[PDB]
Amino acid sequence: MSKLIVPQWPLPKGVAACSSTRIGGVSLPPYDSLNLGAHCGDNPDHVEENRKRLFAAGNLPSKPVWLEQVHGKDVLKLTGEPYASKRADASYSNTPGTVCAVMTADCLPVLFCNRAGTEVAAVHAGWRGLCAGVLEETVSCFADKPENILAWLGPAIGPRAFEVGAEVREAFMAVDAKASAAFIQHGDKYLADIYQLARQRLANVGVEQIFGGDRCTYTENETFFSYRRDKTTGRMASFIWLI
Amino acid sequence: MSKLIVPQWPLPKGVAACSSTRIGGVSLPPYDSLNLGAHCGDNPDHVEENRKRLFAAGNLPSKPVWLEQVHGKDVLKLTGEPYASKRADASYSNTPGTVCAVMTADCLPVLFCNRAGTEVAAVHAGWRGLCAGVLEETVSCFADKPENILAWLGPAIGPRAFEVGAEVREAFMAVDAKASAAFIQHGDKYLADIYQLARQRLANVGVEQIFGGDRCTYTENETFFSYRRDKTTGRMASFIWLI
Ligand SMILES: [Zn+2]
Ligand SMILES: [Zn+2]
């Protein structure tokens, strides 16, 4: 009964993508059902069961190439299983069968693929990496032209729960003063719209086509895990790959 | 104008309580008339006005101490504004003037107080915190004995609309098989009686005096906001305090 989100976009013929929810797994509170993360304290066998179940649900051709997400802006081109460091917050693939995966629980998941369906990419974009331009570095790994790139914004904490400090807002404006529209005042802090921020950097890059960005990990607690909300909790993941 | 629900129970001397409804406000759809929630996308000034009307109608001594409800089971004791964190789903107070409040739109609201009139508490009981035991934790905050504690169940999504998966039912039965009675199958799901579950947990702790729990936020769409019913909508709240 694993419920799986399918990105609403003109998915190209040779591309398959899926994003998970906290439902249909086997873990117990505070990671109650489909927790894919192996680093939040959950029962290690349950995490294996959840992964085994989601891979089947998603018809993944092979195991996802999990990164060592350090909230930076480095993109790891999945050229071949023999890697040095998997340390990074994005992956790019031009290889059929290889699975791009990003692990999240509030941070912005973003999936990319060219219209021809010959190259994909997955990104975990927290504010720091977002601000440092992880989306720009990902896009630049694409041989194709921005014009031909599709971007899907996965479930993340929305503009009603993503409360951030004044530095975060000033951090963004100090790169593209137009980020001012993504912040609304809420006391000595602001309510940021990570989707709006992504769209801006994406536009700056040329990517005219963007979908998703209509969910909230924090608010829809019955569907997603949320680090901001629960502190100790499970993890969801977004996957893309060339068939 | 600001129709205010008054708990039907043996209200003690120095205690006052009220619970709001969607009527008598200033908001427009999908939050038409008295929305109290400031984080559901409503017009803040309207929310600002809806709150001022209620506080007057309710004749509250001060502004309510809004919590950061995360659907957990943490209870916050209101002894001094400088608080480490506001993250909680229940509040307790033995200080006059202090207003305990919980914001809802389906989840179970519960107000507490002792027969003496020296202790009060409010609880936002989502199904997880209810299961994880937020009512027991709230009670164990009272210096008085359960025998003397009065409990009121405010409007929540009733037993004819609160549909849940096998997980919910199982989670509850895990804690106490007796919880099987609050569930009645509907297709591949069940119909839960949140009030029934509250009463059981309340009884396990010796709370002999329980009132209310005859409403349904979902069904009575002309009186309450419903999260299950409307996806985007306002919020009601329940208030209690020592005069
Ligand atoms: Zn993150
Ligand atoms: Zn709730």
UniProtKB/Swiss-Prot annotation, chains A, B:
Its EC number is 2.4.2.1, 3.5.4.4, 2.4.2.28. It catalyses: adenosine + phosphate = alpha-D-ribose 1-phosphate + adenine; S-methyl-5'-thioadenosine + phosphate = 5-(methylsulfanyl)-alpha-D-ribose 1-phosphate + adenine; inosine + phosphate = alpha-D-ribose 1-phosphate + hypoxanthine; adenosine + H2O + H(+) = inosine + NH4(+). Disulfide bonds: none annotated. Its cofactor is Zn(2+). It comes from the Bacteria. The keyword Transferase applies. Zn(2+) binds at residues 71, 107, 124. One of its GO terms (molecular function) is adenosine deaminase activity. Keywords: Copper, Hydrolase, Metal-binding, Oxidoreductase, Transferase, Zinc. Pfam families: Cu-oxidase_4. CDD domains: YfiH. InterPro entries: Cu_polyphenol_OxRdtase, Cu_polyphenol_OxRdtase_sf, Cytotoxic_necrot_fac-like_cat. Belongs to the purine nucleoside phosphorylase YfiH/LACC1 family. This is Purine nucleoside phosphorylase YfiH. It comes from Shigella flexneri. The gene is yfiH.
